[PDB]
Each structure stands twice: as structure tokens, then as C-alpha cells.
Amino acid sequence: SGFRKMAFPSGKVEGCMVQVTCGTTTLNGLWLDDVVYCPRHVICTSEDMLNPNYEDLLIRKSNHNFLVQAGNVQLRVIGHSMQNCVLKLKVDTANPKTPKYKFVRIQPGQTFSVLACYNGSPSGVYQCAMRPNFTIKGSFLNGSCGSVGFNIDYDCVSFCYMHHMELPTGVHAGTDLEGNFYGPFVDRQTAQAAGTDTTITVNVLAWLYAAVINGDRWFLNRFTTTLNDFNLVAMKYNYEPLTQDHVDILGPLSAQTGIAVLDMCASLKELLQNGMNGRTILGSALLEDEFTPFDVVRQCSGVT
Amino acid sequence: SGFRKMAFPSGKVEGCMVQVTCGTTTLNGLWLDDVVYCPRHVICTSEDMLNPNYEDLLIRKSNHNFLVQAGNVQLRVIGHSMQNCVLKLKVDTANPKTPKYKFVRIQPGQTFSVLACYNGSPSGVYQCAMRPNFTIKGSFLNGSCGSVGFNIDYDCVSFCYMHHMELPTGVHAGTDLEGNFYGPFVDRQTAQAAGTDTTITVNVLAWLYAAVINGDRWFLNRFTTTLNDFNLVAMKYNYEPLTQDHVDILGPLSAQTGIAVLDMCASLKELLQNGMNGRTILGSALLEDEFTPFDVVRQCSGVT
Ligand SMILES: Cc1cc(C)cc(CC(=O)Nc2nncn2C)c1
Ligand SMILES: Cc1cc(C)cc(CC(=O)Nc2nncn2C)c1
């Protein structure tokens, strides 16, 4: 028992991190097979970032201008191309440590682990959620760009995120591995509105089930609710509307605990309307939304 | 910017995990050089665990009874010995993936990453603190025993913890890598009092400095305090007494932010006496004590 904000073991991803330098900018790259993927802003100086013409900036660069180092060994760049906001640097050597992998575009509300890196070296790993507004609340300093987000299903790493920037508000924006930004964000140093964010209702409910499984039960009540009634409360408190698809995904947790999803919704309703009253759930004094129903099942069953 | 409960990259430790089976019990082992380290209770059946005579149980076991598998390959056991609560299984092959390592005994209040494993396979990684009462609040199910805690300084892994058991209260107990339990705990299925726990004051102050660095400043006030006055408040709220050694370790964070340690203590005093008033600090609605001053400096500077 016990429930923690657990990240995936990062080893398979650590073996893919490289340092990419172009001119005076250094950031991280992801080496999979004979291709290194990195944010295209590696070709910019901070001066260019105000309004960069990436096509023009990339034309002034040749394969020999992209310095790729994997630990202490230099990779020979034999091709370069821009795909959306990522550069793909073809190298003459396939990464011997390339794990089985996929590139996936996750949905808002889904979770993933981030391996924060600097100069191609791993600094740490943490679990986070893609917010409903397509930002992430990470921990990224200058040089962290190119650090990636991922999930792991047994031996296959699904890469879902590459870090590109910090918004003026301190939240983080990035792309899938085809270079497409999550959200309306552009790789330009400009005012960028992240939309209104909401709490991931299905995740909070999943976390309440994890709390019951692990012994924290004080919030369970004698009430029930309907999806319509619950959604009027979810609206007031800036929670995502709960759908039958969300109830269906909570099925296994409802079956394991014997607590009907709408009964757990009534507990969540009372917690929203009355607060925690100075009490905690799984060591938290707020309603946690960074665990999906899949994460709860995985952690509660010990999937490796 | 941003501040997360970051774990160390687990790759170097993942390469050391093996599965150890003895009779009908399977748990995790740590393979470093030609030695596999695992909890000695691998030789017990649940029946033995009520009051085990480990010396007698181990005498009935031979090298061929310890089945050690590293992924899918079998290791040949050529020696076995018990050191405190750990078994050391000498194998005929040195782990090719053995990183530079040390065995260290951490102090209460210090933090480390745990690589949770099942059947010798990694499931996830999370950061936690050794509580002042020498327990840890982890996430461990049946089969997680032998999972280890560690810190990493550049290329050297300092192993500090090996998981052994869950107390009847749901908190976790384990040993250093020489098999010595942290705390008064015994590897026996019996009633075991974990002492009174307290909040790690120096860590909360370190986390308040991290909050100021990352923009969360609402808690800063016009007050100061003394170590004596602060400790009267720390006593009332079950916080560890702050010492000059703790103030000295907070030195770098005080210098970086320009906020005197006793001024930050006055903010902490007001937060203890008045609460958060429904506000948050770094995404938390409680005072976080699982970040040491070293962790804050490391994360705020991007150490790899
Ligand atoms: C001027 C400029 C403009 C853009 C669009 C991107 C960057 C990189 C960046 O913000 N990186 C970073 N990652 N975490 C925190 N920070 C500061 C820089
Ligand atoms: C009966 C008995 C007695 C002892 C002293 C140890 C064990 C292993 C154990 O408790 N392992 C475990 N690790 N996380 C959660 N749990 C249940 C079993």
C-alpha cells in the first residue's frame, strides 16, 4: 500500500539523450535509430527569438553546423530537415541503445513522465499531466529544451512530448515528436495566452478511488448524485464535465472498490462544496488531478 | 522555472535489478559487481514471518536454492552469507552494468529516490524522505521487497535504502545496504511502534525559498523571529527544532534570495499559526517537507 506520484523508470530514455549545439545555442536532442530530434529554435540566437523566420535561419546552416554529442562521443550529421517545430538530424550511426519506441500525440488530461536534461545529461524525472489547456506545469530552466515526455508499456517507450518553451506565466509548452505544438503556442518570444484551464475530473475521481484502496476513506458519504447534477457543480468549480466515457474508464476502480462512480461523484461534490476542513487525502490537502484511472490501476497492481 | 518533486534518473539502478527466488518467495535483488544483495526474509514463508529464526532458516538453504535471474538470464550462485537483515549472494559473474557506487547510511530528514520493482523489473521511480521516525511513506505492494533507495552525484550512485516491509500502519521500513534497519524495526510480522514523527523544518524552509525563487511570494511578511521563539512554535506544531546547523545549510538560499533565514522562519511561523487560508504554494495546500536545501539548490540550478 501507499500511493505516490510515480514516474516511469527513465533508463530507456536516458540512453537516447544527446547534446545539440548550433552556433551559440545548446539544447537536448533525442537520438532514436539514425535520427536526432530537437527543437528547431536551436538555430536561433535570443535576438532571433522575438520573431524568427525559421526557414531563412535554417538555410544558413549546414550539416557541419549541428554539433551532436552523445555523452563524450561526437555524431556525424549527414542530413537535416525541419518538420513543423522540430529539426531531424540524420546521423551516420544508429543509436545502439534505441529502445522499442513509438511517437504518440497524447490527449489533454493524460499523464506522462518527463526526463529533465541539461547539455544532453539527465538531471531528474517527474510525472505530470498535459493540462486541459495543453500546457504542462514542469520544472525547466534554460538549456532544458529538447527534454522529452513519455510513457512505457512493458518494453516500448511512447514519446509524447518535447519541451520547447516557458510561457511568460511560468507554465510550459512543447510539441509532439512530429514538431506539432500542443495548444495554440508558437516557438516565438511573444505574449501567448494559455486558455482557461480546468481540473481533470476523471483523474480526481481515479485518485479518490486510489485513496479508498489505500485506506483514506473519511470523504465517503451517504449521498449519490447524477451526471447532470454533478456537472452543475463541476461547472461552478472549473472542473471538466464528466461524461459516460469517463464513467466507463472508471469501471475497473468502481468494480474493485464496490463504490459506484456516481457515489464517488457525490463525495467529490461534497469535497468541492465544503473543502477538506483541514484534513488530507493521500498526503495532499487539495484534490489531485495528475493520476489517470490507468495510472491508479497500474500503481495499485504493480505493473512493470 | 517551476518546481517539481523530482527523482534521480533511474537508469544506473535499473541495470542492477535482479529477481531472487528462494523456495516459494520471490523478491528483488541488487546486483553490484559479483554480489546480489536482497532482504533476508526471501528465505521465509509467510508462516515463518511471525517469529523467524533466520540463522536456522538459512542453514537449510544452499547456493542452488537461491534462484537469481537478471532479466531473462540465470546467475550462478557460488556463495551466500547473511549480514544483519540482508543476504549477500556471491555470483560467478560481475554485473557489466555496475555503475560507480557507494553504500551510505542517510540521516533522518534526508531525501532519496526509490525505484519500485516487482519480480526484478522496474515499475516506477519516486522521490521521498526518510522520516524523522525512520519510516518512509512509499508505494510498495507484495513483491516490492528488495527495491532500493538512492542518490546520484554525477556518475556515482549512493545506495541508502533497501525495502523490507510495511508496518501495520501502512508506512514502510527498510535497511541500509549493510542490512541495518533504519529505526527500531525488526523483520518480523509483529506489532511495531513507529515513533512520533515530526515535520522536517529545515526542508519546509528550503521549499519556501524554492517557492520565492519560482514566484510564489504571498506568504512573505513584515516580521522576523528568533531561533528560540520559532522553536516554541515548532514545538507546538510538531516540527523539528531548528538549529544553527540548519540555518547554516540554508545559507546559499538565503544569499540567493536576499531573505534572512529568521525572516523566512517568521513566514513559516505565520503559516503554522494561520494556515494557508485556501491558498497554495508551489501547487501544494500543505507545507512540503520532502525537499532538502541541497535538493532545492540542485533543482534551481539544473545539476545533471
Ligand atoms: C527567448 C525564447 C523564446 C522561446 C519561444 C523559447 C525560448 C527557450 C525557453 O523559453 N526555454 C525554457 N525552458 N524552460 C524555461 N525556459 C526559459 C527562449
Ligand atoms: C508477513 C511479512 C512480514 C514482514 C516483516 C515482511 C513482509 C513483507 C512485506 O510486508 N512487504 C511489503 N512491502 N510493501 C508492502 N508489503 C506488504 C511480510
Side-chain angles (χ1 to χ4, degrees), chain A residues 1-12 14 115-116 118 121-129 137-141 166 170 172 280 283-286 290 299-304, chain B residues 1-12 14 115-116 118 121-129 137-141 166 170 172 280 283-286 290 299-304:
Chain A
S1 77
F3 204 76
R4 280 277 184 178
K5 184 80 57 84
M6 190 171 286
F8 287 103
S10 58
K12 291 167 182 281
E14 290 169 52
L115 176 65
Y118 295 87
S121 293
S123 51
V125 61
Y126 60 85
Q127 185 79 353
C128 71
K137 302 174 189 171
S139 169
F140 294 108
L141 300 169
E166 186 170 70
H172 302 110
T280 68
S284 175
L286 50 76
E290 294 194 304
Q299 185 172 167
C300 293
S301 73
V303 170
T304 66
Chain B
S1 77
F3 204 76
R4 280 277 184 178
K5 184 80 57 84
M6 190 171 286
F8 287 103
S10 58
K12 291 167 182 281
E14 290 169 52
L115 176 65
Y118 295 87
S121 293
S123 51
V125 61
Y126 60 85
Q127 185 79 353
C128 71
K137 302 174 189 171
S139 169
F140 294 108
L141 300 169
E166 186 170 70
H172 302 110
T280 68
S284 175
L286 50 76
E290 294 194 304
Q299 185 172 167
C300 293
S301 73
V303 170
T304 66

Side-chain angles (χ1 to χ4, degrees), chain A residues 1, chain B residues 41 45-46 49-50 54 118 139-145 163-167 172 181 186-190 192:
Chain A
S1 77
Chain B
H41 75 253
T45 52
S46 65
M49 292 308 303
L50 283 165
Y54 287 95
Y118 295 87
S139 169
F140 294 108
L141 300 169
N142 281 342
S144 64
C145 300
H163 186 51
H164 288 239
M165 64 184 196
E166 186 170 70
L167 301 184
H172 302 110
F181 265 93
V186 290
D187 49 354
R188 182 198 174 196
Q189 188 189 356
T190 194
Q192 301 190 56

Side-chain angles (χ1 to χ4, degrees), chain A residues 161-209:
Chain A
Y161 179 81
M162 174 163 280
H163 186 51
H164 288 239
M165 64 184 196
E166 186 170 70
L167 301 184
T169 63
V171 301
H172 302 110
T175 69
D176 57 27
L177 273 296
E178 303 190 335
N180 302 112
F181 265 93
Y182 283 100
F185 311 114
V186 290
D187 49 354
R188 182 198 174 196
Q189 188 189 356
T190 194
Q192 301 190 56
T196 303
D197 201 31
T198 50
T199 302
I200 309 154
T201 315
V202 66
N203 287 8
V204 174
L205 291 164
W207 169 83
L208 287 175
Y209 276 108

Side-chain angles (χ1 to χ4, degrees), chain A residues 7-206:
Chain A
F8 287 103
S10 58
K12 291 167 182 281
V13 180
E14 290 169 52
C16 311
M17 306 307 308
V18 301
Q19 174 189 90
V20 178
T21 298
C22 192
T24 75
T25 310
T26 291
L27 45 62
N28 303 286
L30 182 67
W31 185 20
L32 292 168
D33 303 325
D34 62 351
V35 176
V36 169
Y37 300 82
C38 75
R40 70 181 180 167
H41 75 253
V42 69
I43 71 179
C44 303
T45 52
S46 65
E47 306 87 279
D48 294 314
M49 292 308 303
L50 283 165
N51 190 36
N53 185 311
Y54 287 95
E55 289 78 14
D56 286 1
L57 291 176
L58 190 57
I59 284 164
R60 297 289 181 258
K61 303 301 187 168
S62 295
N63 293 329
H64 71 268
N65 293 138
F66 297 100
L67 302 175
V68 183
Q69 200 174 315
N72 308 320
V73 304
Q74 210 69 23
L75 304 189
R76 186 175 300 279
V77 179
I78 62 166
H80 68 271
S81 60
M82 182 158 61
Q83 174 174 19
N84 301 312
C85 304
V86 298
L87 295 188
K88 295 188 294 196
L89 308 178
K90 192 172 198 168
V91 292
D92 73 353
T93 302
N95 187 355
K97 297 176 191 178
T98 303
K100 284 179 188 182
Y101 76 98
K102 282 175 180 170
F103 286 171
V104 311
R105 187 166 172 93
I106 54 145
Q107 292 295 311
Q110 293 302 118
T111 59
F112 59 92
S113 298
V114 172
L115 176 65
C117 293
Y118 295 87
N119 295 113
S121 293
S123 51
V125 61
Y126 60 85
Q127 185 79 353
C128 71
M130 173 63 62
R131 298 310 313 165
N133 70 359
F134 292 105
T135 62
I136 71 168
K137 302 174 189 171
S139 169
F140 294 108
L141 300 169
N142 281 342
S144 64
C145 300
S147 305
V148 303
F150 59 94
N151 287 272
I152 307 180
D153 194 337
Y154 173 57
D155 64 347
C156 179
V157 181
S158 289
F159 292 103
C160 57
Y161 179 81
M162 174 163 280
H163 186 51
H164 288 239
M165 64 184 196
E166 186 170 70
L167 301 184
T169 63
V171 301
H172 302 110
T175 69
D176 57 27
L177 273 296
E178 303 190 335
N180 302 112
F181 265 93
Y182 283 100
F185 311 114
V186 290
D187 49 354
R188 182 198 174 196
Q189 188 189 356
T190 194
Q192 301 190 56
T196 303
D197 201 31
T198 50
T199 302
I200 309 154
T201 315
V202 66
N203 287 8
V204 174
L205 291 164

